[PDB]
Design a protein around this ligand. Structure first.
Ligand SMILES: Nc1nc2c(ncn2[C@@H]2O[C@H](COP(=O)(O)OP(=O)(O)O)[C@@H](O)[C@H]2O)c(=O)[nH]1
Length: 165
């Protein structure tokens, strides 16, 4: 009975924890209940008429010691690389996360670029187009999600799990 390991990465405050709670329990929390360290939780999904088990990992990013960083990426078959569409700096940091994946993760890890906080359209600072072309260029999948209103959260996880299984 195998649990596919999928890691969340991206700047602190982008809603990674909320994506986790959406995917595992379909919950949202305005007051962040983000891990102070590393956390994981499990989900069962029907992909291609089959049952797939996934463990989604999340990190505060407060610990950089080599043993935990190696442990976080060890065995990961998928990564959701998350930014906040209302913060250009989070989008700029995606290259840093892409680099971290190359440095510590399996070279064949499937990567999905996720623009979270789609609900805040008025405060948008990252055009869909730009992000999309970056993704295409770097060989990533791309989706915009809202943890708050649940838009595309399941779809995001489904897509990655389809390539992983
Ligand atoms: N408007 C909006 N806020 C969100 C969304 N996802 C998370 N947040 C909020 O952004 C803040 C940080 O989210 P959190 O999940 O803790 O970020 P993390 O550091 O990446 O885990 C929290 O106050 C969340 O309620 C979203 O999709 N839309």
């Amino acid at each position: 009975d195998y649990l596919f390991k999928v890691v969340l990465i991206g700047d602190s405050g982008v809603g990674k924890s909320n994506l986790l709670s959406r995917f595992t329990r379909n919950e949202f929390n305005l007051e962040s209940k983000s891990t102070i360290g590393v956390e994981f939780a499990t989900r069962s999904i029907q992909v291609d008429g089959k049952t797939i088990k996934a463990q989604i990992w999340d990190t505060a990013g407060q610990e950089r010691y080599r043993a935990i960083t190696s442990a976080y990426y060890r065995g990961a078959v998928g990564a959701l690389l998350v930014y906040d569409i209302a913060k250009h700096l989070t989008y700029e940091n995606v290259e840093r996360w892409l680099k971290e994946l190359r440095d510590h993760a399996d070279s064949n890890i499937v990567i999905m670029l996720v623009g979270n906080k789609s609900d805040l359209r008025h405060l948008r600072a990252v055009p869909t187009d730009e992000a999309r072309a970056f993704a295409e260029k770097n060989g990533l999948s791309f989706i915009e999600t809202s943890a708050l209103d649940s838009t595309n959260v399941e779809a995001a996880f489904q897509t990655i799990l389809t390539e992983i299984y």
